[PDB]
């Protein structure tokens, strides 16, 4: 059998490389791959997955630095895990049989198993289908699969899929959340609070969750509810900056409610990511440019997280027939490239882009662009125009090194501030300006005069979030060279505290945190109060 022959080649490679390691000899993996394949009469190269699949642990301890696959999965600095909710119905349908004019198949839209705004062919979708949407099974399977690639899971985070979450029966969501927390804790519980207390002392060190929603479920009741879950960031879906479009799109709400939702959430202390929807009906190209410029020029919005999704006519929706009637037309691909290139030149430095384009399978869209890759095309176009972008994701150390191999040389501090939703926002960072490469960031502001949480009443400044990018470093490990444990955060904390004490003129500092991360602040003398970590300022 050939299979045992490849196995023998694998063992040969293993012994050669461990021998090289013992004396510290350096060898090209591909070279020995080729030589072993030739000397054993192999017609095809060996897969690296199987190469990792046989190392003994007393060597996996140190061989991973030369064995990890697709390092970009940790090139940010934090592991990411996605989970799927049970399919259900959106609330608005209470009026008529309208989900959204552009939304894909929902619970009952000619799909055996699917979800609202999801065809059902995403790898996450098949994972959920096999898992029968069970949280625990799918999360264990996914984390195991990720660890197969020899990646540290010291710090992890959770993102939840699904159409709508706030609009679900409470007992179900509590069951779901406690199952998630028990997945990392390994301790069977009975309520949310028990799972919280147990996960406090776990070692997986969860650092937060983010959920999608819509402005209807944005009153302070739901915010307090989410405070009990440790959620950090939120998704809304804006789709426009013009009220008329909403009723044109049958969205079923007002942009105003979105604006007050933004203001209230920012006052509370969460983070928010918006969704932008270019090339819409009754929208000219100049309309798109103007509205996108407005999206940052207005102090009303000035959001933090940005996501973009170009229009995609798909069978089943009303827009399918509208285009089919030859009345809704898209742009040429060059037009889209120019649009994106212009947009990227406009992003303020603090904002971070997370994704571009949808992940829908190709042979389904009546106007789907050929290119699965668009950011690269935009990059080519903006090289052609000789104008650069300043997105966070494009100036962190991880991506910049993995795509250009540039080493920071002189890192310094930088401070900026602006106004948004009435807030006195403030942004701090360490970064190297000459290469414009960034390492660490912090977002801190003064709380608004009107608030929902009385714990913030008077002399209180909230620090929304703090983060240093890079790659995962185990909490016990100190220096694999790199930049994740040099004490950088300490300086930012002390300086932010000093600013709040003097410039803010407050009297007590509060902060949101992940369930595990609380212990970190304990090292600085921060004590708990409700769901908020806090320190007295006098």
């Amino acid at each position: 059998s050939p299979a045992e022959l490849m196995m023998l080649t694998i063992g040969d490679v293993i012994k050669q490389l461990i021998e090289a390691h013992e004396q510290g000899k350096d060898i090209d993996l591909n070279k020995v791959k080729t030589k072993t394949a030739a000397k054993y009469g192999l017609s095809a190269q060996p897969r690296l997955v199987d190469i990792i699949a046989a190392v003994p642990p007393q060597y996996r301890k140190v061989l991973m630095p030369k064995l990890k696959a697709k390092p970009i999965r940790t090139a940010s600095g934090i592991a990411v895990v996605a989970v799927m909710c049970k399919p259900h119905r959106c609330p608005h349908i209470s009026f008529t049989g309208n989900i959204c004019v552009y939304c894909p198949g929902g619970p009952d839209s000619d799909f055996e198993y699917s979800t609202q705004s999801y065809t059902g062919y995403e790898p996450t979708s098949m994972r959920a289908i096999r898992a029968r949407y069970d949280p625990f099974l799918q999360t264990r399977h996914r984390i195991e699969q990720l660890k197969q690639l020899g990646h540290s899971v010291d710090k992890v985070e959770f993102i939840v899929m699904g159409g709508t979450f706030m609009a679900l029966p409470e007992e179900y969501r509590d069951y779901f959340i406690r199952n998630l927390h028990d997945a990392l804790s390994g301790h069977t519980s009975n309520n949310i609070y028990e799972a919280v207390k147990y996960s406090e002392r776990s070692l997986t060190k969860c650092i937060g969750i983010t959920i999608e929603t819509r402005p209807d479920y944005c009153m302070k009741r739901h915010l307090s509810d989410m405070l009990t879950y440790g959620c950090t960031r939120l998704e809304i879906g804006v789709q426009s900056v013009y009220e008329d479009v909403a009723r044109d799109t049958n969205r079923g709400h007002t942009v105003k409610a979105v604006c007050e939702s933004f203001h209230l959430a920012k006052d509370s202390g969460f983070k928010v990511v918006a969704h932008m929807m270019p090339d819409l009906p009754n929208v000219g190209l100049e309309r798109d440019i103007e509205q996108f410029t407005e999206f940052f020029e207005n102090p009303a919005f000035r959001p933090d997280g940005l996501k973009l999704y170009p229009t995609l006519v798909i069978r089943g929706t009303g827009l399918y027939e509208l285009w089919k009637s030859g009345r809704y037309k898209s742009y040429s691909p060059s037009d889209l490239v120019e649009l994106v290139a212009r947009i990227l030149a406009l992003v303020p430095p603090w904002t971070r882009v997370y994704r571009v384009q949808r992940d829908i399978p190709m042979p389904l869209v009546s106007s789907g662009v050929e290119h699965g890759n668009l950011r690269e095309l935009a990059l080519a176009r903006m090289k052609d125009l000789g104008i650069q972008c300043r997105d966070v994701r494009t100036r962190e150390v991880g991506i910049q090194e993995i795509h250009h191999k540039v080493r920071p040389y002189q890192v310094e501090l930088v401070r900026r501030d602006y106004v948004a939703n009435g807030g006195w926002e403030t942004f701090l960072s360490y970064e190297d300006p000459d290469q414009d490469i960034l390492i660490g960031l912090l977002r801190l502001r003064k709380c608004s005069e009107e608030t929902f949480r009385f714990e913030l009443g008077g002399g209180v400044s909230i620090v929304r979030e703090l983060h240093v990018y890079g790659s995962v470093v185990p909490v016990s490990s100190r220096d694999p060279t790199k930049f994740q444990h040099q004490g950088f955060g300490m300086l930012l904390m002390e300086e932010a505290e000093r600013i709040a004490r003097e410039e803010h003129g407050s009297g007590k500092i509060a902060v949101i945190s992940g369930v595990g991360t609380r212990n970190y602040y304990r090292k600085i003398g921060y004590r708990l109060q409700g769901p908020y970590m806090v320190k007295m300022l006098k």
Binding site: G186, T188, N190, R201, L203
Partner: protein, 677 residues
């Protein structure tokens, strides 16, 4: 005059919910929703149940019998800060003691038969532990202790060698062990073990001669073994303890470090000692269990300083037999695996039959017309069929389908055909595949755990639509001609062969609750959630003009109806509702109140020549009382042993005594009564 016949269930999911009595013919004990179950492996029959604790039972614990005889005492710790002792006798209970003081759920228990003032230690979820003296009826909490934070997870008691001095080792979540000695009548923190770095997932003593070895199934994916003894070489940790003015010195140090698993190690069990015809050997067989479906029975050798592993055949625990020939474990969920060693080869093992259940909760069931097999459906998104087995003991034989969404409706069609209702707007129709039919007819003229799910699938023949929302009820007529179904505000009726609409009724305002085909196929009763009922009369596909109905006032019940049933000759119908009201119908009887919320009601298929109609009523608190009302009365009710702990769901009867008890405790109990009674 009611006697239990068969019970089907599964243990809970949390760790440490199974145990064996250490005496010969060791009985098997495991927890459930709120009760406890005693079961034997000899004839593979549940011994009995204990309907005690009122929460998710967390951890059970047998009692040590130093003489080497079957145990008769038990310790249970449940989910609401309640720990119960149990005095077993002749397969029954004498009395139970309900210790109080804990706040959070209790998950660590250990009791020692002192050498009676038995000793109890129990750590609850409130970062605290308590110590209790039990001398006969006298019970008290000897001591209470707590930590700064975190929790303890590992608890096991011990005596100092060659004396009665008691000593405890506790494993908290702080990656180290703590020890306590009861000198001066009080347990004193003596030492700590700074071993591996993870949560402690279990500790086990083993008295080997003069010395005492220790096992630690750690979460750190490692195993470390120390040993206590009496007082170039390393630095061992020793101390002196007071004992009748004698400072006896004891020394402990590491013995070995074993590592053969990948995921977390959950449970370890020493080989229990037993008699070689009065010969008390001290074996060193050890058992291990981990997450990654791996059994390793470690063992040393004549010179094996590092213990030698053995057959790795193979989910939080694996229990071990007295002699060691048997061995058992539970799956991650639902079923469980049972292996036995074979004499021919020391490396030989064979799986063995074990009972199971829906392990979450059952919502519907059915009686086959022939009377040899019953089909049930639960919230586990499964379906199961049960039939008696010969050699008589009933056993689950098939799992016809597994469904993505939950299933909550069921109806019968023909000899192998049925229809189920789920969380969708669809109706599915199943018929038995041939292979299953021949395999069944062979048995009637022993499926294993894993072969079942591989080869118990069924085909689908139909797919029905029409309801604007998820289905909520389903039923079929006796003559097998039409069926009734309703979602959460219309009625849709389907022909059998055509599978198409026959007539649609939109009469009620709120959600439908239950249907009832008239036994003589002359009417169709409908009870809904709007405190009203409807009756529709078939004409000479005859239409179903409303023969009679009720308004908001003519209705007798003041709250939501739940159940309805006809008369054997369709003379009268009977309704039960949450307002604990019982009525007979026009109405011809007084309110037959019972003081408990009505969840289910059913009638005898045949009537006595005395015309004394009898009725079975399933209440909301697990109690099952029965009454009788001839045209113008309590007869017998269920025992404490024969009572559920949750609301009843359906009470169907045998037809050609016996009936069905489909509780919410994910248990299927069958009860027989005297034919004459």
């Amino acid at each position: 005059v009611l006697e239990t016949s068969h019970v089907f269930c599964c243990p809970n999911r949390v760790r440490g919910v199974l145990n064996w009595s250490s005496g010969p013919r060791g009985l098997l004990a495991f927890g459930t929703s709120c009760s406890v179950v005693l079961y034997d492996p000899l004839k593979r029959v549940v011994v009995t149940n204990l309907n005690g604790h009122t929460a998710r039972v967390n951890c059970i614990q047998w009692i040590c019998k130093q003489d080497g005889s079957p145990s008769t005492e038990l310790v249970s710790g449940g989910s609401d800060n309640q720990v119960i002792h149990w005095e077993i006798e002749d397969n029954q209970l004498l009395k139970a003691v309900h210790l109080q003081g804990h706040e959070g759920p209790v998950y660590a228990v250990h009791a020692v038969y002192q050498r009676l003032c038995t000793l109890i230690v129990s750590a609850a979820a409130d970062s605290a532990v308590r110590l209790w003296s039990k001398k006969g009826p006298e019970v008290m909490c000897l001591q209470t202790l707590n930590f700064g934070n975190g929790f303890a997870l590992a608890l096991c008691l011990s005596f100092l060698p060659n004396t009665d001095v008691p000593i405890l080792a506790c494993g908290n979540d702080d990656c180290r062990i703590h020890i306590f000695a009861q000198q001066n009548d009080q347990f004193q923190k003596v030492l700590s073990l700074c071993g591996h770095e993870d949560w402690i997932r279990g500790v086990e003593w083993a008295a080997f001669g003069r010395d005492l070895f220790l096992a630690s199934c750690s979460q750190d994916c490692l195993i470390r073994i120390w040993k206590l003894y009496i007082k170039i070489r390393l630095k061992e940790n020793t101390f002196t303890i007071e004992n009748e003015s004698v400072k006896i010195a004891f020394a402990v140090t590491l013995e070995t470090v074993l590592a053969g698993h990948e995921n977390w190690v959950n449970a370890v069990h020493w080989q229990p000692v037993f008699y070689k015809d009065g010969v008390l050997q001290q074996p060193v067989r050890l058992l291990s269990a981990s997450m990654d479906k791996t059994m390793i029975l470690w063992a040393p050798d004549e010179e094996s300083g590092v213990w030698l592993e053995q057959v790795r055949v193979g989910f939080y625990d694996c229990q071990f037999n007295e002699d060691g020939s048997m061995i058992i474990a539970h799956a991650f969920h639902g079923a469980l695996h049972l292996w036995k060693q074979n004499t021919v080869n020391p490396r030989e093992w064979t799986p063995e039959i074990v009972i199971s259940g829906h392990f979450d909760g059952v919502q519907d069931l059915v009686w086959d017309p022939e009377g040899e097999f019953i089909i049930t459906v639960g919230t586990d998104q499964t379906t199961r069929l049960f039939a008696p087995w010969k050699r008589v003991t009933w056993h689950e034989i098939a799992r016809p389908q597994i469904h993505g969404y939950d299933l909550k409706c069921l109806a019968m069609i023909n000899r192998f055909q049925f229809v189920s209702g789920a969380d969708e707007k669809v109706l599915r129709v199943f018929s038995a595949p041939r292979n299953f039919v021949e395999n069944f007819c062979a048995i009637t003229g022993p499926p294993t755990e894993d072969h079942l799910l591989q080869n118990t699938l069924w085909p689908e023949v139909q797919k029905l639509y029409g309801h604007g929302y998820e289905i909520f009820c389903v039923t079929c007529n006796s003559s097998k001609t039409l069926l009734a179904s309703a979602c959460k505000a219309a009625i849709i009726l389907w022909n059998t062969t055509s599978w198409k609409q026959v007539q649609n009724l939109v009469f009620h305002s709120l959600t439908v609750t239950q249907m009832a085909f008239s036994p003589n196929e002359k009417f169709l009763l409908a009870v809904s959630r709007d405190r009203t009922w409807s009756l529709w009369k078939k004409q000479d596909e005859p239409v179903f003009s409303l023969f009679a109905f009720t308004n908001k006032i003519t209705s007798v019940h003041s709250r939501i109806i739940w159940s309805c049933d006809w008369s054997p000759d369709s003379k009268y119908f009977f309704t039960g509702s949450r307002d604990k009201k019982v009525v007979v119908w026009g109405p011809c009887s007084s309110v037959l109140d019972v003081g408990g919320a009505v969840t289910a009601v059913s009638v005898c298929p045949v009537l006595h020549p005395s015309q004394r109609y009898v009725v079975a009523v399933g209440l909301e608190c697990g109690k099952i009382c029965l009454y009788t009302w001839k045209k113008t009365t309590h007869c017998v009710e269920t025992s404490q042993s024969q009572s559920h702990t949750l609301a009843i769901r359906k009470l169907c009867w045998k037809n050609c005594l016996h009936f069905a008890s489909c509780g919410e405790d994910h248990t299927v109990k069958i009860h027989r009564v005297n034919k004459c009674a």
